[PDB]
Amino acid sequence: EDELYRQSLEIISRYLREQATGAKDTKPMGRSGATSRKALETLRRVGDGVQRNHETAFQGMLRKLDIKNEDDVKSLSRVMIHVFSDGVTNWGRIVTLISFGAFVAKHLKTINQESCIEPLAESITDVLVRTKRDWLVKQRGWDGFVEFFHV
Ligand SMILES: O=C(O)c1ccc2c(c1)N(CC1CCC1)C[C@@]1(CCCc3cc(Cl)ccc31)CO2
């Protein structure tokens, strides 16, 4: 089974859901739990910082995207491919990708479209894993992510 995909989705989905609801998911992690847990703490530390350091730009992009419903949520995939995939890859850009995703997740809860959060996480995961697998594998996937941002 695609273990990198399954782990990426669990990490991305949990962070987005946690950001939108303000509550942690106490369910156990699936495979590679130890790493996923550390990846999630890393995201809470760096991801949260990103949303604040670039709050104005994030607010601006969100406005441009004008997300009001599911169709708008589905249009985000083309934009992620355009902006994220078509560029040099580094952990910072992957953190921005996921961090803005969490920014969007919070928005979805403000407009009572919370059911779109998991489909959004799936879309982010597709872009990340399906267009940057080689890079991710070379950088040791999530173990590498945790090591890169190690305190
Ligand atoms: O600058 C970078 O290194 C960079 C790297 C990645 C990245 C972005 C910028 N952007 C653009 C920025 C401007 C403020 C947010 C958000 C992005 C595009 C817009 C749709 C979208 C939708 C979702 Cl759910 C998540 C990410 C994205 C694509 O992920």
For ligand 1, the distance from its centroid to the CA atom of residue 6, given in whole angstroms, is: 22
Identify which of 1, 43, 8, 45 has the alpha carbon closest to the alpha carbon of residue 135: 8
For 115-126, what is the HEC assignment?
HHHHHHHHHHHH
Query: Do residues 116 and 108 touch, judged by C-beta distance below 8 A?
Result: yes
Which experimental approach was used here?
Answer: X-ray
CA atoms of 17 and 15, how far apart (whole Å): 6
Question: What CATH code is carried by the domain that includes residue 34?
Answer: 1.10.437.10
Who contacts 42 (Cβ-Cβ below 8 Å, separation ≥6)? 145, 146, 149
73 φ/ψ angles, rounded to the nearest 5 degrees: -65, -40
For the Cβ of 76 lying below 6 angstroms from any atom of ligand 1, the answer is yes
Domain that holds residue 106: 1-149
Could you identify the atom of ligand 1 that is nearest to the CA of residue 61?
A: 14
For the Cβ of 103 lying below 6 angstroms from any atom of ligand 1, the answer is no
Resolution limit in angstroms?
1.7
The number of folded domains in the chain is 1
Identify which of 22, 15, 11, 25 has the alpha carbon closest to the alpha carbon of residue 110: 22
Q: Which tokens belong to 5?
A: 């995909």
